[PDB]
């Protein structure tokens, strides 16, 4: 019931791979209104990434069955498939809204004007989980969560482009997901390519900035930025 | 609500890797009191094995940590681990009692005295989930489920030894889990290895007689019998 134990339960849940328990424990420590340490901050991101990832993976395979079996299949089986897809859809959207609530009410809110690292970390997460919502949305409900993802990504970009080094893994990771957001959600290959290229180039010019602690995390993201750039011609 | 839809729901949940949903669909198909076909029998077996299997891996990870923490005596971190262990423990035992009820009320009940193949399959399954109970039980509650696992395994063994060919994958796999029960649960290594080699020897004496269909299935379980022998000193 104590905060120090709640973080320990989340550590245990990750070892037991019960990410629903892990995300619930971190949801509690976030609700205590005390700021999150760098480690506790990564426990929350890992927990809800696994939870929303399980729903998103299940949603993708069911929706694929729903589309490829939407021509000839019996009217009774397709009514069972689309019913299962929407059940997963509501589960995904409920987890996303759960994350965006912690972000707007506790995490982004309790950030000072000088906490550019945590501000960019939480703002990128906001654009991430709004992007996950845009994958399963259609019509006017899609165009709004798309612009909410854009407002979260764009603000995280300006704070990162000014107050953080180009080799910082948080700044690099943001440019990755932001450029992915442009290519897959907005269908803007020209802008997605530009965003990923400048972030890679600016990190290359200051390659002599990597320390022994942050050399791994930064270099792999640069490779992923290259990998995504080769794919987009 | 229809049986053909319930089984198709279970196939969806398997592809979506939502084994909790899959076990619930096959529980409904079983609760219609109509005997289960071969395909529906394995859909139920696969679903609950994944459901109870995720709890077995989580319990083993947590109970391993509980052992290294009960020697330090932190008196505060140890109690939170035992709580998480017993939370997973109750989830595991609830899944087992759910399967054992389906076995006693529907599956074994609807087996005629001449349905030797199905009688061995379900009885072995009964000894299996009673053994899963024995892995997390203590005191006299353990010696109870150990005795229940023994009666189910032994009766399935006598039926298979009399009415089944030694190369039959059902009979071979029973000897595997029965020998595993002897070594790991009852700590009777003389009989665990006697059982494993007897079943392996008897199955080779007529291994020439089979088709290729009953060759890959038959031999794979035999390799497991060999692996267990080498790994059991």
């Amino acid at each position: 019931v104590d905060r120090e134990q709640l973080v320990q339960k989340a550590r245990l849940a990750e070892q037991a791979e019960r990410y629903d328990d892990m995300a619930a424990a971190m949801k509690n420590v976030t609700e205590l209104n005390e700021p999150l340490s760098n480690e506790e901050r990564n426990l929350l991101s890992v927990a809800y990434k696994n939870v929303v990832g399980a729903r998103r993976s299940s949603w993708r395979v069911i929706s694929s069955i729903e589309q490829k079996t939407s021509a000839d299949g019996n009217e009774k089986k397709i009514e069972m498939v689309r019913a299962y897809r929407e059940k997963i859809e509501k589960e995904l959207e409920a987890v996303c809204q759960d994350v965006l609530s912690l972000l707007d009410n506790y995490l982004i809110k309790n950030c000072s004007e000088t906490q550019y690292e945590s501000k960019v970390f939480y703002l990128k997460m906001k654009g991430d989980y709004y992007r996950y919502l845009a994958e399963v949305a259609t019509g006017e409900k899609r165009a709004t969560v798309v612009e909410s993802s854009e407002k979260a990504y764009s603000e995280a970009h300006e704070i990162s482009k000014e107050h953080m080094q180009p080799t910082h893994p948080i700044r690099l990771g943001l440019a990755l997901n932001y450029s992915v957001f442009y290519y897959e959600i907005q269908n803007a290959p020209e802008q997605a390519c530009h965003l990923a290229k400048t972030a890679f180039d600016d990190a290359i010019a200051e390659l002599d900035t990597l320390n022994e602690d942050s050399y791994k995390d930064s270099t792999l993201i640069m490779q992923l930025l290259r990998d995504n750039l080769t794919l987009w011609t | 609500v229809d049986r053909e839809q319930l089984v198709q729901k279970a196939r969806l949940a398997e592809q979506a890797e939502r084994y909790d949903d899959m076990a619930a669909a096959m529980k409904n198909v079983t609760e219609l009191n109509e005997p289960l076909s071969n395909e529906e029998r394995n859909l139920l077996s696969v679903a609950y094995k994944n459901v109870v299997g995720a709890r077995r891996s989580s319990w083993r990870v947590i109970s391993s940590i509980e052992q290294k923490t009960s020697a330090d005596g932190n008196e505060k971190k140890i109690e939170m681990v035992r709580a998480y262990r017993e939370k997973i423990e109750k989830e595991l035992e609830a899944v087992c009692q759910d399967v054992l009820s389906l076995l006693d009320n529907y599956l074994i009940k609807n087996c005629s005295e001449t349905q030797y193949e199905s009688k061995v399959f379900y009885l072995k399954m009964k000894g299996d989930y009673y053994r899963y109970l024995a892995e997390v039980a203590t005191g006299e509650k353990r010696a109870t489920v150990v005795e229940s696992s023994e009666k189910a395994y032994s009766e399935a063994h006598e039926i298979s030894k009399e009415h089944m060919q030694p190369t039959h994958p059902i009979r071979l796999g029973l000897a595997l889990n029965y020998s595993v029960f002897y070594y790991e649960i009852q700590n009777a290594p003389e009989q665990a290895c006697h059982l494993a080699k007897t079943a392996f020897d008897d199955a080779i004496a007529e291994l020439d007689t089979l088709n290729e269909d009953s060759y890959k299935d038959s031999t794979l379980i035999m390799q497991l019998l060999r692996d267990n022998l080498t790994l059991w000193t």
Binding site: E14, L43, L176 | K49
Partner: peptide, 19 residues
């Protein structure tokens, strides 16, 4: 390469029978 976004797998330390 299917999901082109950023993975951060872990933040800690992440049969004998037939199956």
């Amino acid at each position: 390469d299917y999901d082109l976004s950023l993975p951060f797998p872990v933040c800690e330390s992440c049969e004998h029978s037939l199956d």
